[PDB]
Amino acid sequence: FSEEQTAEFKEAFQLFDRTGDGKILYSQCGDVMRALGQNPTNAEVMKVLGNPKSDEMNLKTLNFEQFLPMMQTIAKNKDQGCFEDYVEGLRVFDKEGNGTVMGAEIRHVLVTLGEKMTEEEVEQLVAGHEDSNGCINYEELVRMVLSG
Amino acid sequence: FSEEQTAEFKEAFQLFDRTGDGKILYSQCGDVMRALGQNPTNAEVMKVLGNPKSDEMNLKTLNFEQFLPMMQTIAKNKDQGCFEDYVEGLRVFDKEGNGTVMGAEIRHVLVTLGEKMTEEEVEQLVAGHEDSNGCINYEELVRMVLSG
Amino acid sequence: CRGYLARKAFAKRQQQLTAMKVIQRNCAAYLKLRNWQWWRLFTKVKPLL
Amino acid sequence: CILMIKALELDPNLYRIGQSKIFFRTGVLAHLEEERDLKITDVIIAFQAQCRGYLARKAFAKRQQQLTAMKVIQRNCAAYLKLRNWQWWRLFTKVKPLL
Amino acid sequence: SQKPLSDDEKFLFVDKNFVNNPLAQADWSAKKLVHGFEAASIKEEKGDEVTVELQENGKKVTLSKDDIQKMNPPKFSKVEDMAELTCLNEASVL
Amino acid sequence: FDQSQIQEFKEAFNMIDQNRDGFIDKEDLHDMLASMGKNPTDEYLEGMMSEAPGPINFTMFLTMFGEKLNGTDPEDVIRNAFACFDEEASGFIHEDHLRELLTTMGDRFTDEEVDEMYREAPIDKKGNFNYVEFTRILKHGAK
Amino acid sequence: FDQSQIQEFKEAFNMIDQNRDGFIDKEDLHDMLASMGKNPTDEYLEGMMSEAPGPINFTMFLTMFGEKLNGTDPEDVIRNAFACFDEEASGFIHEDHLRELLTTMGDRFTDEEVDEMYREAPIDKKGNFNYVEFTRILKHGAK
C-alpha cells in the first residue's frame, strides 16, 4: 500500500491521538484507519495492528513507523460488504424480502450477528439512518452507513 | 540537631534523674530517650549505651554529654516499630483473625512472651485500646501508639 | 457501521484531543503561577499597584 | 498464592498452584512449613521488642507533656526577647486603631 | 480415631510430635536428623562418614546414612500421614 | 509588556508617589502601605525595590512591576481553557476538577497550591475555583 | 494569611495566659514573664492597648503577628537555597558574602535589618553559623 498517503495516514493517525507523542493507541489508530477511507469493525480494527492486546490496543500507542504496517493491514478492507449482497441477504434475512428489516430485527442482526456492536453503534448505525417505521430500512441504513 | 531539643534532651534527661544530678541511669537514660519522641525497649534502652552490664544500667549513670551519643544510637535503634511489622506481628498475634488482638492474649504474647518490660507497658498497649474480648484493634492500636 | 462510526467519531476524537491539549497547558500554567515564588512577598506590594 | 510464592521466591513444581489448593508432594511442603515457622518467630519477636519500646512510648507519662510545655514557655520567652524590642513589634500596629 | 476426650481413640488419635515453639528446623538437623533411627545432627560429614551428633544417642558418631536419612523434623514425627514429613524416609516414617 | 499593565504600573507609580519624577523611593511605599494596611519589615520593601538596579527608574520600575506581575501565560487563555475544561456546568472550574486534571494531564501539582489560592484569595468558599476575577487578581485585580 | 505562622501565634497566645478570653490581659502574662524572666510594667501593655483600637483582642494580635511574620515566605525553598550556596558542603553558612552580593544587587540596603539579623544569630569567632536555626529565627523562633 503506497507510501504517498503515508502523509494522510500520519494525519488521521495523529487525529485520534490522545497521548500526543506521534504515537496513537491501537484502537485509536484503528478507528483512524477506519476513517481513512475504510470501514473496518473494531475487531479487525484491532487485529490488523499485529494483533495488539487490549492493553496494547489502548495503552501501547502506535509508532507511525509501525502504522505503515497497519495501513497495509487495513487497506485490505477499504470498505465492507456488497450492497447487492446487502439487499439480497437482508431481503432473504427479512422474513418477507420486502425492502426493509425491523429496527428490532436489524439492530438485532447487527448486535446478534458478526461482531456484537455496542447498541449505540448499531443505533448511530440504525438511528441517523432509520425510517421512522420500526422496520428500519437497511437499504437507506446500510447505504448511508456505507457513505458516512 | 538543634538546641531547642538539646535542652529538651537535658530536661527529659534530668526527668529520669532520680538523683537529679544531670546524670541518669542507663535504663533510665534510654527511658529518657523514649521520653524524647523515640521509644527504645529497655533492651535497646541499654543496648545504645555500649550494651551495658545490668549494673552499668543503674550504677554507671549517664551524664547528658554522654547522653547525646546514646540518644543518637537510640534514634539509630529504629526499634520504634514498622507498621507492616506492627500489623504482621500483631497478625500472628491476631490468632483470632479479627483485625484486632485480644488484650489478655496480647499481654500473654507481650509480657509472658518475647521481650520483657513492665507488665503495665503491655497493659497500656491493650489498655487505652481495651474492647470486646480485649480484642485490641491491633492496626488501630498500633497506628495510634505509633503516632502516640 | 463500525467504519461509519469511526468516521462519525473522528469529528469528536480530534476535537477532544485538541481541547484537552489546550486545557492541560492552561490549567497547568495557572497552577504554576499559583505556586510561583513572587506571589507571597509580591502580594503585599500588589496593594500598592 | 503465586504472590506469596514469588514472595517465597519459588514456583510450584513439587508443590502446585492448582485450582483449590497448592498441592504438595513430599518435599517443598515441610520446607515451606519451616520457612513459615521461622518467619513467624521473626515477626512475633520483632513486634514484641518494637512493642516494648513502643509501650514505653504509649507509657511515657504526663510529665512528658508538662516538660514539653515548659519548653514551649522557654520558647515564648525567647520569642518576646526576639521581636518586642526591635521595630518589628510596631510595624503592623498604630494603624489598625484606624483600620 | 480422633477423640481427645477418650484415650481409647488416643491409641489412634495421633500425637504428632512437635517442638512447642514456632520454629520448625530446630528439631531436624539441617545437616541431617537421623530401624528405630537415631535423630541426630551431622557434626562431620565426609560422605556417609558422617559423625552425626547422634541426638537420639548423643554420639558424634560416624554413622550410616541408613540411620542418617531425612528423619524429618520431629514436628512431623508420629504424624497421622507420613506424607506430612519433609521427606518420607523411614528414618522419619519409622 | 501589556499596555494595560504598563498604564496600571504608571498609575501605581503615581499613587505611591506624590512627586512623580520617574523614580519611586522607599519612604513613599513605606508610608502608603502603612496607611492602607501597615508596611512589613522595611527589608521586604528593599527586596521588592532591589529587583532593579539602584532606585527603581521610570521604565525600570515599569518593567519591574511587569515581571513581578507576569511570568506565566495570561489570564485570558487561563480562564478560556478553564471554561472549555468544565465538566461540571458551574461557570468556574472546581478545585477538585483542576485537581483531577493536574494528575493525569500535563504535570502534577500539589494541593498546597490549591490551599494557598483558597486561603489567600476572596474566592467563593464552596469547593469551586473561580477564574473570571481571580485571574484578574493574577494581573493585580483585587490582591 | 499563611497557616503555620498564625497557628503558632495562636498556640503561643493560648499558652502565655492563665485566663483566656480572646484578649491579652495585663496581669496574667505580666506575672508569667516576671516569673520566668524580666518583670515588665503596666506601661508597656498600656501602650500596647493604646496601640490597638480599644483593648487588644484576638484578631488584633492575630494580624499583628501575622504581618509581623509576613514578608517571610515558607522556609522550605529558603532552606533549600541556603544549603546549596556552599562549595564543600561543611553544613554551615556565612552572612558576609550574602551581604556583599546583595549590596550590589538592586538598590542600597538599610542597616536596621542587618541589626535584626545579627541580634539573633549565633556567631563564633570564625563566623560559624547555620541555616537550620536562621530560617527558624526569621519565622518567630526561639532566640
Swiss-Prot record, chains A, B:
GO terms for cellular component: actomyosin; cytosol; muscle myosin complex; myosin II complex; myosin II filament. One of its GO terms (molecular function) is ADP binding. It comes from the Eukaryota. SUPFAM superfamilies: EF-hand. Residues 4-39, 81-116, 116-148 form the EF-hand domain. Keywords: Acetylation, Motor protein, Muscle protein, Myosin, Repeat. GO terms for biological process: actomyosin structure organization; myofibril assembly. PROSITE patterns: EF_HAND_2. InterPro entries: CALM/Myosin/TropC-like, EF-hand-dom_pair, EF_hand_dom. The keyword tRNA-binding does not apply. Myosin is a hexamer of 2 heavy chains and 4 light chains. Regulatory light chain of myosin. Does not bind calcium. This is Myosin light polypeptide 6. It comes from Gallus gallus (Chicken).
Curated annotation (Swiss-Prot), chains F, G:
Ca(2+) binds at D17, N19, D21, D28. Residues 4-39, 73-108, 109-143 form the EF-hand domain. GO terms for biological process: myofibril assembly. Keywords: Acetylation, Calcium, Metal-binding, Motor protein, Muscle protein, Myosin, Repeat. One of its GO terms (cellular component) is cytoplasm. Myosin regulatory subunit that plays an important role in regulation of both smooth muscle and nonmuscle cell contractile activity. Implicated in cytokinesis, receptor capping, and cell locomotion. This is Myosin regulatory light chain 2, smooth muscle major isoform. It comes from Gallus gallus. The chain holds residues 26 to 168 of 172 of the full protein.
